[PDB]
mmCIF file with all atom_site columns, C-alpha atoms and ligand atoms in Angstrom:
data_model
loop_
_atom_site.group_PDB
_atom_site.id
_atom_site.type_symbol
_atom_site.label_atom_id
_atom_site.label_alt_id
_atom_site.label_comp_id
_atom_site.label_asym_id
_atom_site.label_entity_id
_atom_site.label_seq_id
_atom_site.pdbx_PDB_ins_code
_atom_site.Cartn_x
_atom_site.Cartn_y
_atom_site.Cartn_z
_atom_site.occupancy
_atom_site.B_iso_or_equiv
_atom_site.pdbx_formal_charge
_atom_site.auth_seq_id
_atom_site.auth_comp_id
_atom_site.auth_asym_id
_atom_site.auth_atom_id
_atom_site.pdbx_PDB_model_num
ATOM   1  C  CA  . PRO V 1 1  ? 68.936 -11.230 -34.642 1.00 0.00 ? 229  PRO V CA  1
ATOM   2  C  CA  . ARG V 1 2  ? 70.113 -14.162 -31.957 1.00 0.00 ? 230  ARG V CA  1
ATOM   3  C  CA  . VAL V 1 3  ? 67.303 -16.492 -32.396 1.00 0.00 ? 231  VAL V CA  1
ATOM   4  C  CA  . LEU V 1 4  ? 69.135 -19.509 -31.308 1.00 0.00 ? 232  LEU V CA  1
ATOM   5  C  CA  . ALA V 1 5  ? 70.533 -20.118 -27.992 1.00 0.00 ? 233  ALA V CA  1
ATOM   6  C  CA  . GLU V 1 6  ? 73.517 -22.248 -26.303 1.00 0.00 ? 234  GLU V CA  1
ATOM   7  C  CA  . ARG V 1 7  ? 71.303 -25.238 -25.196 1.00 0.00 ? 235  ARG V CA  1
ATOM   8  C  CA  . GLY V 1 8  ? 74.338 -27.349 -24.452 1.00 0.00 ? 236  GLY V CA  1
ATOM   9  C  CA  . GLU V 1 9  ? 73.852 -30.735 -22.706 1.00 0.00 ? 237  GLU V CA  1
ATOM   10 C  CA  . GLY V 1 10 ? 71.424 -29.135 -19.679 1.00 0.00 ? 238  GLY V CA  1
ATOM   11 C  CA  . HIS V 1 11 ? 70.324 -25.955 -18.948 1.00 0.00 ? 239  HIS V CA  1
ATOM   12 C  CA  . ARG V 1 12 ? 69.592 -23.365 -21.530 1.00 0.00 ? 240  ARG V CA  1
ATOM   13 C  CA  . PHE V 1 13 ? 69.612 -20.239 -19.435 1.00 0.00 ? 241  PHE V CA  1
ATOM   14 C  CA  . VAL V 1 14 ? 68.324 -17.314 -21.736 1.00 0.00 ? 242  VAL V CA  1
ATOM   15 C  CA  . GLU V 1 15 ? 70.430 -14.261 -20.705 1.00 0.00 ? 243  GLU V CA  1
ATOM   16 C  CA  . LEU V 1 16 ? 68.239 -11.507 -19.947 1.00 0.00 ? 244  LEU V CA  1
ATOM   17 C  CA  . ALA V 1 17 ? 68.972 -8.412  -21.676 1.00 0.00 ? 245  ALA V CA  1
ATOM   18 C  CA  . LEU V 1 18 ? 69.242 -5.903  -18.788 1.00 0.00 ? 246  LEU V CA  1
ATOM   19 C  CA  . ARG V 1 19 ? 68.859 -2.487  -20.955 1.00 0.00 ? 247  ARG V CA  1
ATOM   20 C  CA  . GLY V 1 20 ? 66.567 -0.877  -18.949 1.00 0.00 ? 248  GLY V CA  1
ATOM   21 C  CA  . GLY V 1 21 ? 64.341 -4.068  -17.085 1.00 0.00 ? 249  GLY V CA  1
ATOM   22 C  CA  . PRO V 1 22 ? 65.683 -5.124  -13.853 1.00 0.00 ? 250  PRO V CA  1
ATOM   23 C  CA  . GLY V 1 23 ? 66.366 -8.131  -12.738 1.00 0.00 ? 251  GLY V CA  1
ATOM   24 C  CA  . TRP V 1 24 ? 65.888 -10.402 -9.561  1.00 0.00 ? 252  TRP V CA  1
ATOM   25 C  CA  . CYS V 1 25 ? 67.675 -13.934 -8.932  1.00 0.00 ? 253  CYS V CA  1
ATOM   26 C  CA  . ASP V 1 26 ? 64.733 -15.997 -8.393  1.00 0.00 ? 254  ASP V CA  1
ATOM   27 C  CA  . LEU V 1 27 ? 67.345 -18.664 -6.749  1.00 0.00 ? 255  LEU V CA  1
ATOM   28 C  CA  . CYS V 1 28 ? 68.248 -16.387 -3.879  1.00 0.00 ? 256  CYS V CA  1
ATOM   29 C  CA  . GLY V 1 29 ? 65.548 -13.171 -4.101  1.00 0.00 ? 257  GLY V CA  1
ATOM   30 C  CA  . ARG V 1 30 ? 67.685 -9.971  -4.507  1.00 0.00 ? 258  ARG V CA  1
ATOM   31 C  CA  . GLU V 1 31 ? 68.453 -7.954  -7.355  1.00 0.00 ? 259  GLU V CA  1
ATOM   32 C  CA  . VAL V 1 32 ? 70.890 -8.776  -10.514 1.00 0.00 ? 260  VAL V CA  1
ATOM   33 C  CA  . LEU V 1 33 ? 72.933 -6.672  -12.397 1.00 0.00 ? 261  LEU V CA  1
ATOM   34 C  CA  . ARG V 1 34 ? 74.597 -8.457  -14.802 1.00 0.00 ? 262  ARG V CA  1
ATOM   35 C  CA  . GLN V 1 35 ? 73.151 -10.404 -17.786 1.00 0.00 ? 263  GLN V CA  1
ATOM   36 C  CA  . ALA V 1 36 ? 71.018 -12.976 -15.532 1.00 0.00 ? 264  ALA V CA  1
ATOM   37 C  CA  . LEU V 1 37 ? 70.772 -16.193 -16.918 1.00 0.00 ? 265  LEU V CA  1
ATOM   38 C  CA  . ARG V 1 38 ? 67.030 -17.164 -17.106 1.00 0.00 ? 266  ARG V CA  1
ATOM   39 C  CA  . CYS V 1 39 ? 66.945 -20.825 -17.909 1.00 0.00 ? 267  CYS V CA  1
ATOM   40 C  CA  . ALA V 1 40 ? 63.012 -20.844 -19.021 1.00 0.00 ? 268  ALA V CA  1
ATOM   41 C  CA  . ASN V 1 41 ? 63.736 -24.773 -19.785 1.00 0.00 ? 269  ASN V CA  1
ATOM   42 C  CA  . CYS V 1 42 ? 62.958 -25.464 -16.128 1.00 0.00 ? 270  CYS V CA  1
ATOM   43 C  CA  . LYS V 1 43 ? 64.267 -23.074 -13.821 1.00 0.00 ? 271  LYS V CA  1
ATOM   44 C  CA  . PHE V 1 44 ? 64.425 -19.340 -13.694 1.00 0.00 ? 272  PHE V CA  1
ATOM   45 C  CA  . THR V 1 45 ? 66.681 -16.009 -13.964 1.00 0.00 ? 273  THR V CA  1
ATOM   46 C  CA  . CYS V 1 46 ? 69.401 -16.743 -11.784 1.00 0.00 ? 274  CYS V CA  1
ATOM   47 C  CA  . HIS V 1 47 ? 72.506 -14.317 -11.274 1.00 0.00 ? 275  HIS V CA  1
ATOM   48 C  CA  . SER V 1 48 ? 75.510 -14.613 -13.319 1.00 0.00 ? 276  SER V CA  1
ATOM   49 C  CA  . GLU V 1 49 ? 77.791 -15.650 -10.762 1.00 0.00 ? 277  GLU V CA  1
ATOM   50 C  CA  . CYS V 1 50 ? 75.072 -17.957 -9.345  1.00 0.00 ? 278  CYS V CA  1
ATOM   51 C  CA  . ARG V 1 51 ? 75.085 -19.966 -12.587 1.00 0.00 ? 279  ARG V CA  1
ATOM   52 C  CA  . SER V 1 52 ? 78.257 -21.546 -11.538 1.00 0.00 ? 280  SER V CA  1
ATOM   53 C  CA  . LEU V 1 53 ? 76.755 -22.398 -8.276  1.00 0.00 ? 281  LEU V CA  1
ATOM   54 C  CA  . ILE V 1 54 ? 74.005 -24.103 -9.838  1.00 0.00 ? 282  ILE V CA  1
ATOM   55 C  CA  . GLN V 1 55 ? 74.724 -27.625 -10.899 1.00 0.00 ? 283  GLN V CA  1
ATOM   56 C  CA  . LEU V 1 56 ? 71.065 -28.894 -11.203 1.00 0.00 ? 284  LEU V CA  1
ATOM   57 C  CA  . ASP V 1 57 ? 70.456 -30.638 -14.809 1.00 0.00 ? 285  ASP V CA  1
ATOM   58 C  CA  . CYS V 1 58 ? 67.691 -29.547 -17.260 1.00 0.00 ? 286  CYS V CA  1
ATOM   59 C  CA  . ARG V 1 59 ? 64.450 -31.082 -15.581 1.00 0.00 ? 287  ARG V CA  1
HETATM 60 ZN ZN1 . ZN  U 2 .  ? 67.418 -26.383 -18.075 1.00 0.00 ? 1600 ZN  U ZN1 1
HETATM 61 ZN ZN1 . ZN  U 2 .  ? 71.951 -15.130 -6.933  1.00 0.00 ? 1601 ZN  U ZN1 1
#
């Protein structure tokens, strides 16, 4: 249903619905449990708590 995503003044980060499929924090390279934030706009599927550490602008 949710077609629009909170773009904001920077990264969009598309919440990866982990309802059966795992997620790998491309940033670090480990396994992600929580709704990993995947900024397909430039970055990738990063860890939820890691998103706060990523202060990069939307390339
Ligand atoms: Zn971005
Ligand atoms: Zn991480």
